[PDB]
Design a binder for this molecule. Structure first.
Ligand SMILES: CCCCCCCCCCCCO[C@@H]1O[C@H](CO)[C@@H](O[C@H]2O[C@H](CO)[C@@H](O)[C@H](O)[C@H]2O)[C@H](O)[C@H]1O
Ligand SMILES: O=c1ccc2ccccc2[nH]1
Ligand SMILES: [Br-]
Ligand SMILES: [Ca+2]
Ligand SMILES: [Ca+2]
Ligand SMILES: [Ca+2]
Ligand SMILES: [Cl-]
Ligand SMILES: [Cl-]
Length: 337
């Protein structure tokens, strides 16, 4: 009964059938995670890195996190570290997790970044200064309905849906909440005048994103192996539309703005990503989901492996025939499709 729910939540028997791509390279300079990433229309890619998550491996617990930038229009894109400026943020404790971008009517680019300084959660709002390759911190957002934020999707400069992957803030309590299988994780709509729960009762809600026309919201429920599709309404509420099931732990969801396809980074075996073992490291798996509203969504494994190259894939996105894949605490891979 408990064996058994544990073995299925954590997919503890799963081994990964490989699925290769013609030409993949490790992104040089990423060795401490690349948990989330987001690619602008112009090919600039933001990557958050250095996440320290309780119970989870990290190779440099003393180094603070960073937001990296890659220009994917380059033949061999090199990463650089974005300089964060401003006096409203303590960088010494920057511990970045999910991110999302919003482009205003004036073409100002805002970056929203989930941050875990100590045990806590905030969402930091930055303005991207392209010529300078820097991030100007604008605002720290925190809220009782954002106790344990995993990812967000922005729908304005300080308006977003956020997944909380746990109900509790304290990591000792979170650990009990997860192992007891309470499924109290929930999703919050945040805006300046109006903050509310929009969906609830998830077993580790994680990735979240939105269709390019703004009518559907997708939420990954990691330990249930589901992605939930909701209709999103003009008053910002969500209503359940459908649920897809997978044989893998789904992490972050990227949405291709031309087709609306989902690109999902996934953990084939949960035991390996939650209990790190250098000799038995977590693998990587990327799904593409097409026609997600149709009667049978088309799901393809685009890339899959056991960890000998890339460990703990959480996120994948595409840009002009290339695929960039990030991980919780390891490296990043850039691939021809
Ligand atoms: C809402 O649902 C909430 O979470 C789960 C199921 O989703 C319920 O029940 C839970 O509690 C016990 C704790 O001893 C667990 O061993 C059990 O596996 C679990 O399902 C809770 O009583 C309810 O609080
Ligand atoms: O976004 C996250 C954050 C932590 C984490 C831990 C184990 C597996 C997947 C995870 N995803
Ligand atoms: Br450019
Ligand atoms: Ca995100
Ligand atoms: Ca639910
Ligand atoms: Ca995530
Ligand atoms: Cl708490
Ligand atoms: Cl569709």
């Amino acid at each position: 009964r408990q064996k058994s729910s544990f073995q299925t939540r954590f997919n503890v028997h799963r081994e990964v059938t490989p699925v290769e791509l013609p030409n993949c390279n490790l992104v040089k300079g990423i060795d401490n995670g690349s948990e989330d990433l987001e690619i602008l229309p112009n090919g600039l890619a933001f990557i958050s890195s250095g996440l320290k998550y309780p119970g989870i491996m990290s190779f440099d617990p003393d180094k603070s996190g960073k937001i990296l930038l890659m220009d994917l229009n380059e033949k061999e894109p090199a990463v650089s570290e974005l300089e964060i400026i401003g006096n409203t943020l303590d960088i010494s404790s920057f511990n970045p997790h999910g991110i999302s971008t919003f482009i205003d009517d004036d073409n100002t680019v805002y970056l929203l970044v989930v941050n875990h300084p100590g045990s806590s959660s905030t969402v930091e709002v930055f303005k991207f200064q392209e010529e300078e390759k820097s991030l100007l911190h604008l605002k720290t957002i925190r809220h009782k309905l954002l106790p344990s934020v995993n990812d967000i999707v922005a729908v304005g400069p300080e308006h977003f849906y956020a997944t909380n992957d746990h109900y509790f803030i304290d990591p000792y309590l979170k650990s009990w909440e997860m192992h007891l299988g309470l499924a109290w994780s929930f999703v919050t709509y945040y805006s300046p005048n109006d903050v509310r729960v929009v969906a609830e009762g998830f077993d580790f809600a994680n990735g979240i994103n939105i269709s390019p026309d703004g009518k559907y919201v997708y939420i990954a429920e990691l330990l249930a192996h589901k992605i939930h599709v909701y209709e999103k309404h003009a008053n910002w509420t969500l209503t359940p539309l459908r649920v897809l099931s997978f044989d893998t732990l789904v992490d972050n969801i990227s949405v291709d703005p031309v087709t609306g396809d989902l690109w999902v980074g996934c953990h084939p075996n949960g035991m390996r990503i939650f209990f790190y073992d250098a000799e038995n490291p977590p693998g990587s798996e990327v799904l593409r989901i097409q026609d997600i509203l149709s009667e049978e969504p088309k799901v393809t494994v685009v890339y899959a492996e056991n960890g000998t190259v890339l460990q703990g894939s959480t996120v994948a996105a595409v840009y002009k025939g290339k695929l960039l894949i990030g991980t919780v605490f390891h490296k990043a891979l850039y691939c021809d499709l």
